């Protein structure tokens, strides 16, 4: 997270950390949507160009954490993965189209003040909140700058959703309908963006209708981090809601 | 908070009915340091 700040305790209880057992390493961000399912980005699990194709036993999810490095005994819960599901039409060859994946925990986790699932949007909520100008929130333990460079505590930053035409003109990469972009424009003054290590994390918005937090997107990709004229791209979660349902109602 | 579950609790697991409400914030009617910025963005 670039140009953000330290999250408060219990501020993002659905925040999940994707972790590599050995050599121990923070791989990505993810989000807790129930006691059994975790949502993240497909490229965090699968990316052949870099020889990446993790399996259930390669990873470990850490839930309810605040500190990046220390073991938060009696606070965080560590769960094994039972199975990983990557979207069939996930395009890792070109633009990372449909960059989403689901991970089923081996044993359901218990909720607490530090562990709580986020809501996934319904058609109505997504239609009214995913508008240019509205701000969402991104969290993660990724790098603090493009070039320890890593934070000691979970970071958070609020970023404005950007008009589709502008997102399209800010890059040569083909942008699809299951993608949206966020971030401040060069002349808006404020800065901020997701960065290496934040991928897979949630882009959440608070509903003004029912006070609940909804996950509108998943940190997907960007060119560099917090560069003027560039924007972070996110997987449009509602757009891929059918695949999520399909996978879950079957396992 | 009015909310209608969408997934089958059988396969989805428990937790959806009470989703998006944080124990240390919404549940106690306490706001975090920057959520006001999000709400204002709906007006500005």
């Amino acid at each position: 997270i670039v140009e953000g700040s330290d999250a408060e305790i219990g501020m993002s209880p659905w925040q999940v950390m994707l972790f590599r057992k050995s050599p121990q390493e923070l791989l990505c961000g993810a989000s807790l949507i129930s006691d059994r399912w975790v949502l993240t980005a497909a490229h965090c699990l699968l990316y052949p160009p870099w020889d990446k194709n993790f399996t259930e036993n390669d990873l470990l999810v850490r839930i309810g954490k605040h500190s990046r490095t220390r073991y938060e005994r009696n606070i965080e819960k560590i769960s094994m993965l039972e199975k990983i599901y990557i979207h069939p039409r996930y395009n890792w060859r070109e633009n990372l189209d449909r960059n989403i994946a689901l991970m089923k925990l081996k044993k359901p986790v218990a909720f607490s003040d530090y562990i709580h699932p986020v809501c996934l949007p319904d058609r109505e909520t997504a239609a009214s909140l995913l508008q240019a100008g509205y701000k969402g929130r991104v969290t993660g333990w990724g790098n603090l700058k493009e070039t320890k460079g890593q934070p000691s505590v979970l970071q958070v930053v609020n970023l404005p959703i950007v008009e589709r035409p502008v997102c399209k003109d800010s890059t040569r990469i083909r942008i699809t309908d299951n993608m949206f972009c966020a971030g401040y424009k060069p002349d808006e003054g404020k800065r901020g963006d997701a960065c290496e290590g934040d991928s897979g994390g949630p882009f959440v918005m608070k509903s003004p209708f029912n006070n609940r937090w909804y996950q509108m997107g998943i940190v997907s990709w960007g060119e560099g981090c917090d560069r003027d004229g560039k924007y972070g791209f996110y997987t449009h979660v509602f757009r891929l809601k059918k695949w999520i349902q399909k996978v879950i109602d079957q396992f | 908070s009015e909310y209608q579950t969408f997934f089958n609790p059988r396969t989805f697991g428990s937790g959806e009915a009470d989703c998006g409400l944080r124990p240390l914030f919404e549940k106690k009617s306490l706001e975090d340091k920057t959520e006001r910025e999000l709400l204002e963005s709906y007006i500005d």
């Binding site: 319904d122 109505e124 009214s128 909140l129 508008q131 100008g133 509205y134 209708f209 | 709906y42 007006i43």
Partner: peptide, 9 residues
């Protein structure tokens, strides 16, 4: 910059 308040749901 000219913004509409969300409504419904």
């Amino acid at each position: 910059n000219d913004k509409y308040e969300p409504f419904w749901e």
